[PDB]
Amino acid sequence: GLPVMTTPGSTQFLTSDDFQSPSAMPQFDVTPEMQIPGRVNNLMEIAEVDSVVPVNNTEDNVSSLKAYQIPVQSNSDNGKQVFGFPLQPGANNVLNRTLLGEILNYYTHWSGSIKLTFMFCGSAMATGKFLLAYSPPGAGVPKNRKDAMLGTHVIWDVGLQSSCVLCVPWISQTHYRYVVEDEYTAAGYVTCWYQTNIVVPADVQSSCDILCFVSACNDFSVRMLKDTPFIRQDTFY
Amino acid sequence: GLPVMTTPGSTQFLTSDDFQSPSAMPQFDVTPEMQIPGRVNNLMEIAEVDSVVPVNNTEDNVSSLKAYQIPVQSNSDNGKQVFGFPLQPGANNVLNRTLLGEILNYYTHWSGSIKLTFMFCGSAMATGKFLLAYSPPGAGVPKNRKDAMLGTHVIWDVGLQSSCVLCVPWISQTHYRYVVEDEYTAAGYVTCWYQTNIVVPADVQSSCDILCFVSACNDFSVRMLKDTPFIRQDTFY
Amino acid sequence: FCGSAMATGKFLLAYSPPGAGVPKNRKDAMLGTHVIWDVGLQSSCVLCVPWISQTHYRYV
Amino acid sequence: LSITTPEEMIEKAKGETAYLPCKFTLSPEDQGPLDIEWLISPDQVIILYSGDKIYDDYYPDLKGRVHFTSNDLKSGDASINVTNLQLSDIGTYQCKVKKAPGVANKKIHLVV
Amino acid sequence: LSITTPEEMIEKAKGETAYLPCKFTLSPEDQGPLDIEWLISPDQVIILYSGDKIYDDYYPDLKGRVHFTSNDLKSGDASINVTNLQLSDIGTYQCKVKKAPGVANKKIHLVV
Amino acid sequence: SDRVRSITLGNSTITTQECANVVVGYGVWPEYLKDNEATAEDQPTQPDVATCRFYTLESVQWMKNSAGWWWKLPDALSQMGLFGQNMQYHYLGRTGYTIHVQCNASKFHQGCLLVVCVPEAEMGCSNLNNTPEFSELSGGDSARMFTDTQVGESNAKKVQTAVWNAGMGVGVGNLTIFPHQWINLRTNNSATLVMPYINSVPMDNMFRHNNLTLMIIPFVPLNYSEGSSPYVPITVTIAPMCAEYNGLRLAS
Amino acid sequence: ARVADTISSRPTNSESIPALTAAETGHTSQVVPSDTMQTRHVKNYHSRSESSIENFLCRSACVYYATYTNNSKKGFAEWVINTRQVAQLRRKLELFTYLRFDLELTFVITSAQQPSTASSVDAPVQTHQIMYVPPGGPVPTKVKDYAWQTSTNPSVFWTEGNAPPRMSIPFISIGNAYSCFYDGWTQFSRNGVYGINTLNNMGTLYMRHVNEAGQGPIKSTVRIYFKPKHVKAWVPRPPRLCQYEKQKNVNFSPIGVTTSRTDIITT
Amino acid sequence: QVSTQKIHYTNINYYKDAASNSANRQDFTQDPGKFTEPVKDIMVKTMPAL
Amino acid sequence: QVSTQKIHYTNINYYKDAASNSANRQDFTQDPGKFTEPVKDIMVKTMPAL
Amino acid sequence: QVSTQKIHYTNINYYKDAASNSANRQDFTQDPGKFTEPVKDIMVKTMPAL
């Protein structure tokens, strides 16, 4: 008869407890394991895979394959914009349903930097240059090329190699950032501008298209697991 | 099946218990700490800061800055009193709302000695002398300078340096003292008397003012934490 | 300061390099090189203007 | 809370002014609001003190004849001055003070 | 949920168009459906916004005279434009927004 | 001796004949951001001569019926040269200040000031449900002043300027727990504080968050006889120490 | 952690004056009572243990209580977690500017019968569910819904007649310390509300019954109790004098410094 | 694991987190020098201040 | 038996099965190279890809 | 920690206070000489008292 006293917090069912439990079928021998290829060990081995970013929604391309293409045509005037969006990878409706965005909508805080792989899926004799700018917040969106070249930017040329990875850095006052749309920890905007035109020879089509990927760096991290807002239910199937 | 017996005192919720508890979010990694300047480690690093003592209430100066000033004028007759109050640093309504008095109104017992920093905030060519007396209890308040100079007192002269710290000692029969108004452990009175007049040259104002601080020594201590009587409530905000 | 003994004050001794005009407010002159002089027992203050020029010499 | 002498006998003459004392001290637990009553049984209240304001029109035979004495009622003074004593003022007077969590009585027997 | 200025006084003239602002921000816990009301007490609803569709035939004296202003109501705009102000439009207007688990009010006093 | 100091910084120099000792923060000196504490992913810029100099704000007249003044500290330096231009093009930035306030009178005036530097000074509005706006809370290099009378209820968005509550609902006698000094015209002439970077995050934006507040409150009011000089001005000088920035963008 | 002792002294007469000083330099004097009188060597055995931070703050206090009726539609209680609503705890927190602590949430749940109409009512023991939602998760609207069960938010299930439930929450913040005060807006155009920060959001708490309406409505009531542990405080602050009025802002009405007395020499 | 109280007592950590431990209640250190004397030039008690 | 937490803690197995133990929560290993670079010829960062 | 009873028994202190321990019940010491003979000159049994 050892004397004990029961602390508060007993006879409860916490849904994230770590306790042992008596087995139902004792002395069960499981079937032995196998070297199945492709063992995932961490969910940060999924954010380091690229996925195409549907950056061309516009209410008519959402139910199609046109949502992944950015139309790039041989313009007549110079210094025009190609696209642009704020960088909220759990709150914006462009980086939402990508492979990175459906991992961040299980967690609450995130950190680290983001890679943005582009690809010129155009013709072979058509060349050009692009300016991939990322402006940190505090001001509005940039509106001219003269205002966007002050931020962080690379200048991309298309040749034999047809990719360019703008790696946006981690410039923030806090050690983490929310995934829901907040104003305190916004992460600026990412734009893309014509440097020169898209020149093209005779008897070639003009409107070349560009794809865009997204991925995480080697130093990405998350925190505070929550439940997703993307799946509803009203009955049992 | 180890045999146990539950002592009385189980299945209760004591509001000052020290027990472990299962976490809700396991394997959480907190954000790392920072060398923020000004780390407080003990609440006896707050009572060793001076604060101005509102010793001039008189029902008209309470809603003003006049409550901190002691009017000191060039008197005509000699041996008059400047101020006076009993030394109950949680019970009197002069040492109540100071920085020392709003720490002692979280505890019940106190001990140690008290410093009383004064400061002559007058002109530069006006001199004078003051007598800062502290009389232990048992008798009434002193009423003449002849009765107050028998206690513990310093004689303050104003010159280049313009401060004088009367350090009242710890003279009490008990090892502690209450903070509420009791008659058993009262701590006497502190008065202040004109030694000589305040002389002054021509074309200078006469009514110089004096500020008064209060602080604790290096050997102050408290006990028996309670809840304060200064903040009421009737609803949720 | 060749004044009285009980009179005090403070002064701002500014030197502005060329390129702009003369300064016109105290807000414009405190951007240059300046010392802030107090008068007390000692009654002097030596603003030492530096040698800020593109050339190794200067005309008279 | 404790009164100095919870019962005594006071002997005065007619036309004089009675002085019924009621003093107390304060134990450290007493932190609530103050309350002071006075009774008579020749159980009718004759004066009150609650919420810092005096209410004193309660007994018709003693209308405008009884007052508190001191100006410092929160220091241990609850004495009243009965002016113009008459023959019909015979009865036990009860000084009920109630500062929570304390309570005390004082039965003053007044015979003229 | 929080409105910029929960009460003020607006002074306009007759025949003009009033502009009663109601802006807000969004704390991160607010994830439910949106709800926007407007009241009057010269406690009658004058406009609604729930389920992404506007219902606006509620007050007979203001029939077809009040409209929302912006096209981006889920960004922190709830201002209304009161056209053709008359003398009988005196009363406190109440902008009630309720996105769960948040709720806020704004009592706009309009005097012409 | 022990009365004279001469603090210099960059291309300026503040000298004082009569002043007390200098008080430095909570016991630390403003140094650069160490690599263990940083969180930004790029390299900072350190001008270090273009910012670290003594800017001078406007002056205020100390009348007899004065109340007090306050400045919001990384907002008064918004137009002062290369500090005000590096604050706009960047996004982050940490600072450490060296506040200096000076007010001279003769041996015949009497009075006493209190110079305190309050971190995170939230002020109270006039109406209990509103919040004060930006134009009535601080000014570019212009001191906002307290009053000696409670602000009426008819105002919509105005700061409560009751001086015995110091605007923040706190007793003004307890304000000495912050780093502070006293200006006393009997024995002192100039007060000086050194304030390190005090914030819960290692770097912060500077247009949205004023993380210091220099308050000046006269306890003993100014008083003299007829025949003395009636105009006594106060003038404050602030110099940022060891500043650095991050995150270029457009102007705003 | 004993306090300092006191050493004896002799009647001196010399040039070294320990009592005269100057408070202009912001330096609170460090004198001992052995410098202005004659003392005896007192062995001193007091302790400064109960004045530390971990003995001043680690005590449980109520933060909120809400009631909810079993026989109702939308009968359930939501509450965003914040310290600002009670006043006996809030004044203890604003002594310091930056705090850092974990938390031990504890609930005390009581029930009461409503004046029902049905005859010979009898109910078995009830069950309560206290769901904790981190900031951003999907929240439920009605009580009979599938978002209550089918979720990975950490909830706790409790039945009556047992010990009160208790869960522990670590330091969930984005900065390095909770900010008790935030002077400056949250939008870069400097418009809108004043002191609203996104540095001390901890989430909401959703509480409801699990049983169904058998014969008689039951109105419950649940109190929530904090307990900060491992606390580190920074940059102290003078204590709040005027009364609180709102939970978000710091606004107030002016009042005098202290209660008055009759005359400056009245003891 | 085993330490003294205010004789000894035995304390074992059970859960494998850090926020699950009991309160320390024995962090006895103080340093009031960063509030009383936050000055640059050092100040002696016996000598005059100026 | 005794290991560190996120100081130490003590864990004892009681039941004599394998499915009765508590969750590990401390299997900290990762290898993203089988998803990022699943190629045959190795690829350097600095050199061009073709 | 382990001592004899009125065979042995094992007692462990759990809480980290001093007022939380159980009662001692084994403080067996007495000295009646300060009540029976509180005198200055010592007194022998066998000799006469005066």
UniProtKB/Swiss-Prot annotation, chains D, E:
Chain ranges of the Ig-like C2-type domain: 1-109
- Cystine links in this protein are C22-C95
Q: Which residues are glycosylated?
A: N81
The superkingdom listed in its UniProt entry is Eukaryota
| Annotated tissue distribution | Expressed in pancreas, brain, heart, small intestine, testis, prostate and at a lower level in liver and lung. Isoform 5 is ubiquitously expressed. Isoform 3 is expressed in heart, lung and pancreas. In skeletal muscle, isoform 1 is found at the neuromuscular junction and isoform 2 is found in blood vessels. In cardiac muscle, isoform 1 and isoform 2 are found at intercalated disks. In heart expressed in subendothelial layers of the vessel wall but not in the luminal endothelial surface. Expression is elevated in hearts with dilated cardiomyopathy.
- What happens to this protein after translation, modification-wise? N-glycosylated.
Q: What is known of its domains?
A: The Ig-like C2-type 1 domain mediates homodimerization and interaction with JAML.
Q: What does this protein do?
A: Component of the epithelial apical junction complex that may function as a homophilic cell adhesion molecule and is essential for tight junction integrity. Also involved in transepithelial migration of leukocytes through adhesive interactions with JAML a transmembrane protein of the plasma membrane of leukocytes. The interaction between both receptors also mediates the activation of gamma-delta T-cells, a subpopulation of T-cells residing in epithelia and involved in tissue homeostasis and repair.
Subunit structure of this entry?
Answer: Monomer. May form homodimer. Interacts with LNX, MAGI1, DLG4, PRKCABP, TJP1 and CTNNB1. Interacts with MPDZ; recruits MPDZ to intercellular contact sites. Interacts with JAML (homodimeric form). Secreted isoform 3, isoform 4 and isoform 5 can interact with the extracellular domain of the receptor. (Microbial infection) Interacts with adenovirus subgroups A, C, D, E and F fiber proteins as well as coxsackievirus B1, B2, B3, B4, B5 and B6 capsid proteins.
Protein name (database record) = Coxsackievirus and adenovirus receptor
Q: Which organism is it from?
A: Homo sapiens (Human)
Q: Which gene encodes it?
A: CXADR
Q: Where in the full protein does the shown chain start and end, and how long is the full protein?
A: 20 to 137 of 365
